[PDB]
Structures are given as C-alpha cells and as structure tokens.
Amino acid sequence: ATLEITDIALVQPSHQPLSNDQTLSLSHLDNDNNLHVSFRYLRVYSGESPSAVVSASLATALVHYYPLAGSLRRSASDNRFELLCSAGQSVPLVNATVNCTLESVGYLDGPDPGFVERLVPDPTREEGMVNPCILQVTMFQCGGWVLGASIHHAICDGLGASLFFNAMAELARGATKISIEPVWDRERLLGPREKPWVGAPVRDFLSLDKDFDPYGQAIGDVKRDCFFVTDDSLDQLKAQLLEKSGLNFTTFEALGAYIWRAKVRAAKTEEKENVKFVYSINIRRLMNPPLPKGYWGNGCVPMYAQIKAGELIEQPIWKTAELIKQSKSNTSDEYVRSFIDFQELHHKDGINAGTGVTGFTDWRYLGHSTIDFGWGGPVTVLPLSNKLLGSMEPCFFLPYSSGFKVLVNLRESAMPEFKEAMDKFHKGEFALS
Ligand SMILES: CC(C)(COP(=O)(O)OP(=O)(O)OC[C@H]1O[C@@H](n2cnc3c(N)ncnc32)[C@H](O)[C@@H]1OP(=O)(O)O)[C@@H](O)C(=O)NCCC(=O)NCCS
Ligand SMILES: [Ca+2]
C-alpha cells in the first residue's frame, strides 16, 4: 500500500491583494513559545477532481487569507514573530496518490495503515516558517480522498483554521464571496497593558526557565492510539460519580479525570511530582469587549488544574472531576489579560508549565461537518500533532457521525497499562474510589 507525490502546485490568490510589502505583527497569544509548532491534521472524504476544486477555492480564499502565504520571521528587535507578506506569495499544495481504497483501509478510523503520517506535510521548524501553511490532496483508488494541512500554530487556532477552511468549502460549494470577512487587528485587540499586571491564577500555573524545553523532554517514543467510548459507558460513569459526590459532571470533566488518572498511574509518576491537566478554552465570547466574529488568530488560552501525582492516582475520581470543574471558573476577561501581561513581562525568560503536563482538546465541535467541498462533510478527522499546550502527550476528543473516539498520545512504555485501563472502562469497572 504506497503513496506517491505526483506534483506540488504553488497557489496564489486569484487576484493580488497587495501592492506593497506588508509586515504583520502577531498577538501576544500568538507568540507564546508553546505554539512554535507546525499543527498537522487530516480530513477524509468519500467530475472535476478534488485537486482542482480545492486549489481553485484556495486561490479565491487567499484574497482575504493572504497571510497564510506569508513567511514567519523572528524580528531582530524582541525575537517575536512577525509575518512578511509580499505580492507573488503562494500556498503549496501537495498532490499525492495512494494505490488503495478508503474502505480497504477502514477510512483511517482504525489502526495506521503505515502511511498516515505521509498524508500531511511534516515541515521542519525552519521549513514551517518559510511556508506556515501547506495543504495536501491525496487520492485513493475509489475516488475517495484526504485533505492534509500543516498550519503553523502562531497564525491561528483550530477555530481560526476552521474559519479559513469553511470559507474554502463555501466557495467550492458555489459561493462567489465568503460569508465572514477575516479580521486581523491582532496587537490592538490582544496586546498587553501599558503597566502590565498578572494575577495569582496565571502566576500559580507558570514558571520561568530558559533551558527548559517542554517538547524536548526525555520520555521515550510517544505512541498514538484511539479508544471508542460509548454514550452508555459515559452515562453509567456520570451516574456513579453523582451517586458518590452529588455533582453532575460533563463528559469532559468525568472522562477527562479518568483518562488523566490512567495516564499518570501508567507513566509511573512519582507521588510528589506536580502534574497538570491543561486545556484550551475559547475566549472570543468572554473578553470585554468580545473579539470580532472573523478573528482567526489564537483566541484560546490554556486553563489548568494541578495536583501531586500521588493524590491524583489515589483520591476518588469524583474529587479529580470536581477539580477540573472548578478550573473552568478561573476563566475571566482578567485571566486572559493576566496571561497576555505575563508574556509581555517574560517572553524571553522561558515561560513554561513545567513537567507532567497532560494536554486535552475537545474537537467534538469546532465545525468539521460544515467543511464540504462537494463530496460531503468529513467521514474522519485525525490530528497528527503530539506537541501541544505544553504537553508531548496530548489527548483529543474526536467528533461523532453510539459514541466517539478518544485519541491519546502516550510514551510507549505506559501504553500497555493505559490500554488495559480503557478496557476496564469499556466494561464499566471504573475503580472510582
Ligand atoms: C472548556 C470546554 C472544553 C469544556 O466543555 P464541557 O466540560 O463539555 O462543558 P460545556 O459547558 O462547554 O458543555 C456542556 C455540555 O454541553 C455540550 N455541548 C457543548 N457545546 C455543544 C454543541 N455545540 N452542541 C451540542 N452540545 C454541546 C457538551 O457536550 C456538554 O455535555 P456532555 O456532558 O454531553 O459533553 C469547552 O467549553 C470549550 O471551551 N471548548 C473550546 C475548545 C476549542 O474549540 N479549542 C480549539 C483550540 S486548538
Ligand atoms: Ca509561578
């Protein structure tokens, strides 16, 4: 089962939005060192070819979204990213071909056929700044196909990228203009205060060490695996957590606690180490004033819960679920401004969440089914990046179309015991207490 790169196309805006070079600056959220990665993910789809249709809509989208065709540069000044856009810039589109069928490979929902990494560019740090947006279209023998995207995380979050992709789709679906015009305004809207201030809720999470690389820790090879989780399993868990605590818990709080406990037990973390649950909340709608609907920059911030590893592995699940629930209350306009001001004060002083960070991202929404180029909405979405939110072992909740998959990245050494913890879970043996 083999994949071949047939050609690479350089796709320019359909008309050139720029006369003159324009150097754009990024928000203080965009320049967090934790987002210095090329975020990689793929969408699987069941005549003009998808290559033509995708590339033509990319062209027209790039009129408004031309910064994706830019280059990221460190600025001599302060070593923050700026984005160099000139006329003639392009997005690369890799055109590929695999000699098999989507159904013969179970639409990529199952185990990796062994080319799944080859389905989306994997740029180096240097390459991924020259080209902060690379797309790939890979045809299967059934006329089924995959859209891969490598987007540098400094330019947008999942929601921002989704804005960009929904625009391409809607143009592919016949539209001649896009429904939501993207807004830059980045250093105006998410810039620091003149006299920076940082509250305890941000100071209690973060730490300075210029030598510490959160994505360079020596944990071994990190494996990817998905576990199917049933609505019934989740409702029995929720009902027992309620029996024992008197609280009702979201799936994210309940399953999140179980998964975090299992991960940490299984990595054999030492009782006294501080470990973290870190997730990404939307703040577009919570700022004062709220951010414009077309903001496609980073509009997310990390929230956290923290606890000694021994307490997590030995206290009841419902105490851990409650702690994750409490963390959602730190969420305020001020928390975000506290966060931005810490980046202002300490950007070059190695801001970090320390060791033992597990990252959690809910992808169950984000607007994937609306991304339809003429072959229906995606039948499977699969994010390949394992470097996120300060974690080398991030976990995603993937969407529906009875239940949904959880994707976990975990050090090879811990994966067996974890797989066993998910088998137990699938049988309702939750060992809550
Ligand atoms: C922080 C967060 C993950 C916590 O979610 P939560 O604990 O599930 O709590 P919420 O109040 O958001 O959701 C409450 C309930 O409504 C449901 N819900 C939320 N949005 C929904 C939607 N669009 N449609 C249907 N149900 C929805 C949830 O599934 C949950 O019920 P559940 O127990 O069945 O899962 C979530 O609120 C959030 O902010 N997500 C944004 C993440 C994001 O988009 N990141 C991308 C960055 S790269
Ligand atoms: Ca601190």
Numbering used by the authors: 2 to 47, 55 to 409, 420 to 451
Please, what does the article write about this entry?
We noticed that a single oxidation of Cys308 to sulfenic acid was present in the CoA-bound structure, suggesting that it may play a role as a redox-gate for the proper substrate entry. Moreover, based on our observation of Cys308 oxidation in the CoA-bound structure, we generated the C308A and C308S mutants, and assayed their activities in buffers containing a concentration gradient of hydrogen peroxide. Even so, varying redox environments had little effect on coumarin synthase activity for wild-type (WT), C308A, and C308S enzymes. Thus, C308 oxidation is likely a crystallography artifact in our solved structures. Guided by both the CoA-bound and scopoletin-bound AtCOSY structures, we modeled the trans-6OHFCoA substrate in the COSY active site. This reconstructed pose of trans-6OHFCoA indicates that residues Phe40, Tyr42, His161, Cys164, and Trp371 engage close contacts with the substrate, and are likely involved in specific substrate binding and catalysis. Indeed, we observed conformational differences of an active-site loop containing Tyr373 and Leu374 between the CoA-bound and scopoletin-bound AtCOSY structures. In the CoA-bound structure, Tyr373 exhibits π-π stacking interaction with the adenine portion of CoA causing Leu374 to shift towards C2 of 6OHFCoA, relative to its conformation in the scopoletin-bound structure. The Y373A and Y373F mutants exhibit WT-level coumarin synthase activities, whereas the L374A mutant shows a significant decrease in activity similar to that of the W371A mutant. These observations indicate that the π-π stacking interaction of Tyr373 with CoA does not contribute significantly to the coumarin synthase activity, while Leu374 on this dynamic loop region is likely involved in catalysis, albeit in a nonessential manner.
